Amino acid sequence: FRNKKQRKQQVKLRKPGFAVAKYVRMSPRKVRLVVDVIRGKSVQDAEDLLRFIPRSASEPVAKVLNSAKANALHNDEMLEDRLFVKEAYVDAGPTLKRLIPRARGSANIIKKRTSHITIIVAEKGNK
Amino acid sequence: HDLKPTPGSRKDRKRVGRGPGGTDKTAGRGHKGQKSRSGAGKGAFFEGGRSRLIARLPKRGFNNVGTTYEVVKLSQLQDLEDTTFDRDTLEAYRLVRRKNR
Amino acid sequence: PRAKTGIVRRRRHKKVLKRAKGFWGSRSKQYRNAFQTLLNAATYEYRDRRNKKRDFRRLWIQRINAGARLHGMNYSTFINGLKRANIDLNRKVLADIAAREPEAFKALVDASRNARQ
Amino acid sequence: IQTGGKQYRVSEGDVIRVESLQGEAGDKVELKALFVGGEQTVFGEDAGKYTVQAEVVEHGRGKKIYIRKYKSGVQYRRRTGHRQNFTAIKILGI
Amino acid sequence: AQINVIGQNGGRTIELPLPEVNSGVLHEVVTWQLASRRRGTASTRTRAQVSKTGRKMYGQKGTGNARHGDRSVPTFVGGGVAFGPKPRSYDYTLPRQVRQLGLAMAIASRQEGGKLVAVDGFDIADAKTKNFISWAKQNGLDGTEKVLLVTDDENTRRAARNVSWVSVLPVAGVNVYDILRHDRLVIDAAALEIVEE
RNA sequence: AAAGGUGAAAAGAACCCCGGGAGGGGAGUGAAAGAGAACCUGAAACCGUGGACUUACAAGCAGUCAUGGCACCUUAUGCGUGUUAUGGCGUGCCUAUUGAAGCAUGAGCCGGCGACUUAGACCUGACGUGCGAGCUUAAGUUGAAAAACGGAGGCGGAGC
RNA sequence: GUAGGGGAGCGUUCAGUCCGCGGAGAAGCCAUACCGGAAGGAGUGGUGGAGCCGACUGAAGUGCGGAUGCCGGCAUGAGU
Ligand SMILES: [Mg+2]
Ligand SMILES: [Mg+2]
Ligand SMILES: [Mg+2]
């Protein structure tokens, strides 16, 4: 224990099987669709389903998924063939407001959103 | 060192009745001051006017302001005060500093 | 001197906001609405006490005679009877006696007929 | 009931309106109205015979309840705290 | 009737305000004093006018929701400060007899408690202050109480650059505040202290 | 127009992993990265992930009172906290009105800004203080980490 | 009990004074089944990383849901 301040130093705080693509120029709502088929499974499948799934959000999710893997494995010395998407999700980063002209003088703002795709891989096992 | 906010420059209270809190219009959840229409954010419906008896009432008299004398009552002299001397001075200190008139 | 509202308002708000719990949608997440819900809330709260009193005596009277009539009486009668016997004077717990202790309840039943005709 | 119990039972600690006799042990006696000391069903007056003896356990301040009133359009909103005092009394009587 | 401490010891002299010191009046006092020290400084473009902004906006009607004048008014961020503060004075002349009854009633205060006089302080010697502290000791001034020293004598005062203790004060140009401000009064100079009118 | 804030000090991240990059994970510096440069705190609306209790004969201002079920019990196992089922009861808020759930006005939601004040030796009254049949100063003067001086003048004092 | 009048108080900043508090940790934030007749207050824990409670008195740009209010952020319509 000690007290907060000593803890901060006795510990460093880490993130097992975790990666995160911050600021992917896509709509969270759009990416979620893909991140959703991949939630909770054989990180192999995830690799596989992405290769085929038609949505263009797939690349980024791909990249984050193979980065979270290249961590669980390296910085975490994990056993890859027991790895599975423990958790994944999409949060919205800033928003690229941009102005668009409209009929008869009026104007409009197109919201070009963006997303933080983060995915957490973890060794499975039954027991 | 026990505990004691001390008495003195801080223990110097007001007086009670000395000075009451102001008035911010909002007494209970339900303030929306002044009538309830026909009056606000302005100032002219005054309190005088010249038709409300003022006018209509007859007069021209005539103002003068001649001379105004300094009434020096009798008891001022008699009763007490041992002829402290009227003259045209002492009376002052005696009390009747009117000057001018 | 200037004098913001800072922290003074957030709090006033959290107070209400936190009163609303299982308040459905907006009503439990938006100040204005949540608050407003609590005015009608006043109406019910207050008037419901002066009122569950009304509701409860009803539950009591309902049972008191589904036992009363379980022998051949009925609240109306039954009650005036125990009445006929100043002796008897429960009325409060009477139902319960009629719900849990049948042995007893009968007693009071017949007791009234025996002070009735 | 409307103050000071009655009925049968076995002696439990129940809460009622304040009893005035403070302290504790304050041996309290309640007339009686009905009861079965031995399954003996006993009605009014014929029960007055028997009685109950309970001791004042403690004095309490109920659970704070807020009394709020409200009428619409006419403004009118009323907030006021409240909580009723009592007396704990361990039953034990005849 | 306070016994002098340096170079003599008369005392007795001086009628003191009845009944026994009255905050109310000492309050009526102190307050007034501060009001006077209260300077007038109101940084505020109260004026919807004193702020920078045009004067005609959009369209009274038909623009779809609005109805505005300039963009410089109580209700507009960056507008002007309605009923805001402007410079002023909050200085009034408290009747003289009270300013009198004032410290008078404040001296009492100090007499009834921890009063203290002194006729000259050959006990000083130069500025030093070191020795000024010295005297204090055997003078009862441990260093645990706020001391106010009224007295002319240029060179004497010159000894008081020490905190919490004392606070200097010229030609009996005393003041109900200070006195009531610090603990013990070192009335000193029997100057303003004995003989008036 | 809007626009502030790494750290005490750059010691501002060598080297390795996934990526074209962006980004991130380790390592290392640092008291701290539960300070990393889209760097003090970081509320609310608003989006989302996981968990708990629920929901696919139901008519609902959205709650409230009552009871049962389930879960949990750091101001808290003896009272409760959360959630929920069924029952009763129940016509948003404000404004403007003779009369509003009102098919009458206003308002998407939150945060912050946002409205009875200031001045005049002005008038009038309540309360309080000082003097009191008397009561006061204004301008200025000289001192000021202080306030005294200053009666020009004003108000009581006779009315018609 | 509506307009209105009268009474007692809660809170916010700033100022004077008293008692203090703080890097083994302030303010602010966040959670809570306690306290007070209300406005409101406290305890405990988490966050935070430097200033800060309580008390008496004084001054206030002092308390908000409404104004097709103002500025900013984010929603709905809709992945249309
Ligand atoms: Mg400005
Ligand atoms: Mg209309
Ligand atoms: Mg609004």
Side-chain angles (χ1 to χ4, degrees):
Chain A
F1 178 69
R2 267 295 173 219
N3 80 332
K4 314 168 181 183
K5 171 206 188 70
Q6 310 296 305
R7 188 180 81 238
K8 291 190 186 180
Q9 19 196 200
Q10 51 172 289
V11 191
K12 183 177 192 169
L13 229 48
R14 292 189 186 55
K15 311 181 181 211
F18 166 109
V20 53
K22 266 205 163 192
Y23 310 120
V24 181
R25 248 269 56 219
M26 297 202 175
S27 161
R29 195 192 173 181
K30 155 201 182 184
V31 184
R32 275 82 176 281
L33 288 187
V34 177
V35 176
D36 273 333
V37 294
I38 268 174
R39 175 104 49 49
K41 41 203 298 188
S42 173
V43 61
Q44 251 185 302
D45 302 359
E47 282 181 288
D48 309 345
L49 299 187
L50 289 165
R51 218 195 315 297
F52 288 68
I53 270 172
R55 294 302 179 61
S56 96
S58 287
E59 213 174 11
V61 163
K63 283 198 174 157
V64 200
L65 186 67
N66 193 66
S67 169
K69 177 203 213 176
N71 279 183
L73 295 202
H74 180 129
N75 311 324
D76 299 290
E77 299 165 299
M78 275 169 76
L79 214 61
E80 79 160 54
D81 307 8
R82 178 138 277 160
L83 290 179
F84 83 134
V85 171
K86 185 177 185 169
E87 77 191 300
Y89 50 62
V90 200
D91 309 305
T95 281
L96 308 212
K97 319 282 206 160
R98 184 172 89 182
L99 191 161
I100 186 177
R102 207 80 187 216
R104 287 159 170 172
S106 97
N108 266 2
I109 319 177
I110 306 282
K111 257 139 297 167
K112 294 224 210 170
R113 320 242 175 180
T114 68
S115 327
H116 295 326
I117 312 155
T118 97
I119 135 71
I120 298 183
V121 311
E123 305 194 312
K124 181 187 167 179
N126 326 142
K127 177 214 54 179
Chain B
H1 310 303
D2 206 298
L3 194 65
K4 57 291 169 181
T6 68
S9 187
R10 93 199 42 40
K11 184 65 175 191
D12 176 33
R13 291 183 290 146
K14 324 180 181 189
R15 263 176 189 163
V16 188
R18 190 158 113 65
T23 339
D24 303 301
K25 261 256 199 184
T26 293
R29 167 263 180 161
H31 255 61
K32 307 186 288 164
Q34 310 244 180
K35 281 175 119 295
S36 196
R37 270 166 149 185
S38 98
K42 173 271 184 96
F45 287 72
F46 301 163
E47 295 208 301
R50 51 61 160 47
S51 162
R52 288 162 279 168
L53 291 199
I54 300 296
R56 290 80 195 265
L57 239 45
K59 189 168 176 183
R60 193 186 71 184
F62 138 66
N63 182 261
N64 202 343
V65 184
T67 313
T68 300
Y69 281 60
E70 292 80 310
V71 179
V72 173
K73 181 172 179 185
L74 219 44
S75 84
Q76 314 315 287
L77 266 160
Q78 289 191 292
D79 177 53
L80 275 182
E81 272 235 308
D82 327 312
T83 300
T84 38
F85 255 135
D86 318 332
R87 297 172 159 166
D88 60 309
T89 316
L90 287 159
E91 31 196 51
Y93 274 46
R94 304 189 303 86
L95 188 52
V96 273
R97 49 171 156 186
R98 267 301 306 178
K99 313 188 182 182
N100 150 57
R101 296 176 184 165
Chain C
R2 198 174 184 307
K4 300 170 185 287
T5 51
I7 76 90
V8 178
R9 199 195 292 114
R10 264 193 294 279
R11 303 169 170 181
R12 166 218 231 50
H13 276 171
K14 277 187 290 301
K15 295 195 192 295
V16 203
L17 232 28
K18 95 146 169 280
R19 289 180 171 178
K21 35 192 64 274
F23 279 7
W24 204 109
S26 68
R27 277 186 198 275
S28 74
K29 329 297 263 40
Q30 295 181 179
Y31 176 63
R32 326 252 301 301
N33 194 48
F35 172 84
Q36 180 186 313
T37 303
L38 304 185
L39 292 159
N40 284 295
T43 298
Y44 298 130
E45 286 176 30
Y46 172 85
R47 310 201 191 180
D48 280 289
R49 303 187 193 99
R50 343 296 298 140
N51 190 78
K52 45 169 145 197
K53 258 225 184 301
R54 268 177 285 196
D55 277 4
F56 259 114
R57 300 196 167 175
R58 187 173 327 205
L59 181 285
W60 289 52
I61 291 182
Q62 291 187 282
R63 308 193 169 158
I64 294 180
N65 59 330
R69 296 187 194 51
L70 205 63
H71 303 324
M73 287 192 89
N74 75 331
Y75 187 87
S76 185
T77 290
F78 171 92
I79 308 297
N80 164 79
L82 287 70
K83 174 190 163 181
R84 258 44 168 46
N86 211 106
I87 330 194
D88 279 279
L89 249 158
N90 312 85
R91 312 296 174 59
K92 37 82 179 67
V93 182
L94 196 50
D96 183 276
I97 295 175
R100 303 177 205 170
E101 270 66 62
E103 292 164 301
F105 189 59
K106 178 158 193 170
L108 297 125
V109 168
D110 202 55
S112 188
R113 180 193 61 63
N114 272 306
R116 181 175 190 60
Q117 291 184 295
Chain D
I1 60 188
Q2 305 195 61
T3 302
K6 66 166 181 182
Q7 296 303 302
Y8 196 49
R9 193 199 333 305
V10 189
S11 290
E12 314 174 300
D14 89 46
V15 182
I16 101 112
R17 334 303 281 188
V18 299
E19 286 311 286
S20 156
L21 296 197
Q22 188 159 281
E24 346 82 288
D27 313 302
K28 299 285 175 165
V29 309
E30 274 316 289
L31 201 169
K32 244 164 190 170
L34 178 294
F35 57 67
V36 288
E39 269 181 284
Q40 280 186 305
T41 54
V42 190
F43 335 78
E45 310 189 299
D46 208 78
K49 299 171 190 171
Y50 303 67
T51 70
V52 272
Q53 309 144 51
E55 297 207 332
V56 173
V57 178
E58 174 173 40
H59 290 323
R61 212 180 150 43
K63 162 82 175 181
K64 178 62 157 321
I65 276 177
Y66 290 65
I67 309 182
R68 300 171 60 205
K69 292 168 174 304
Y70 163 62
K71 276 184 274 74
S72 77
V74 100
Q75 280 319 74
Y76 199 78
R77 317 187 160 185
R78 298 291 129 134
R79 181 71 177 304
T80 65
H82 172 105
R83 73 144 93 189
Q84 192 141 71
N85 322 326
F86 62 62
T87 311
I89 64 106
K90 173 153 189 173
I91 302 294
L92 208 39
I94 308 175
Chain E
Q2 191 24 50
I3 73 169
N4 288 212
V5 172
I6 297 301
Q8 76 156 298
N9 203 296
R12 269 50 206 162
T13 310
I14 302 179
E15 281 177 46
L16 254 33
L18 283 175
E20 300 177 292
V21 168
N22 178 311
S23 64
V25 184
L26 283 80
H27 189 194
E28 167 152 48
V29 175
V30 278
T31 293
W32 162 70
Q33 282 199 60
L34 301 174
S36 80
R37 322 193 170 179
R38 230 173 69 52
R39 199 176 182 201
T41 35
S43 170
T44 255
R45 290 301 211 296
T46 322
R47 302 77 201 302
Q49 175 143 52
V50 293
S51 80
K52 256 315 177 187
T53 295
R55 288 282 196 293
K56 287 176 197 286
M57 195 185 277
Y58 263 80
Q60 182 64 193
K61 175 277 166 50
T63 53
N65 334 296
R67 196 181 180 176
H68 290 328
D70 303 54
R71 207 164 293 176
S72 91
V73 324
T75 57
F76 275 69
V77 155
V81 187
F83 302 153
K86 305 305 291 188
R88 46 172 176 168
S89 208
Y90 193 180
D91 176 8
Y92 61 116
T93 67
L94 219 192
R96 181 170 277 135
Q97 207 192 294
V98 198
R99 303 196 298 183
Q100 307 296 42
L101 201 174
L103 59 183
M105 180 170 266
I107 267 67
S109 322
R110 284 291 175 281
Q111 307 295 284
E112 341 159 291
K115 47 173 153 195
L116 185 174
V117 287
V119 172
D120 222 298
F122 170 52
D123 24 282
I124 296 315
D126 338 312
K128 304 295 196 172
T129 278
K130 165 177 185 166
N131 195 76
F132 162 62
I133 304 193
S134 173
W135 132 294
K137 299 178 173 172
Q138 325 310 191
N139 268 283
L141 310 187
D142 308 288
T144 306
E145 295 315 322
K146 287 179 172 193
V147 202
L148 172 49
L149 280 61
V150 183
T151 189
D152 299 41
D153 33 308
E154 223 101 62
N155 287 315
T156 57
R157 311 199 213 75
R158 186 197 176 195
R161 175 240 200 131
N162 65 311
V163 294
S164 188
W165 286 231
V166 303
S167 189
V168 175
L169 216 50
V171 189
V174 304
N175 172 54
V176 187
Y177 184 57
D178 294 284
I179 159 190
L180 201 40
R181 178 186 180 210
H182 304 65
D183 291 293
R184 310 304 194 303
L185 168 49
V186 147
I187 322 164
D188 188 287
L192 185 151
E193 184 172 55
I194 71 183
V195 176
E196 174 199 297
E197 314 164 317

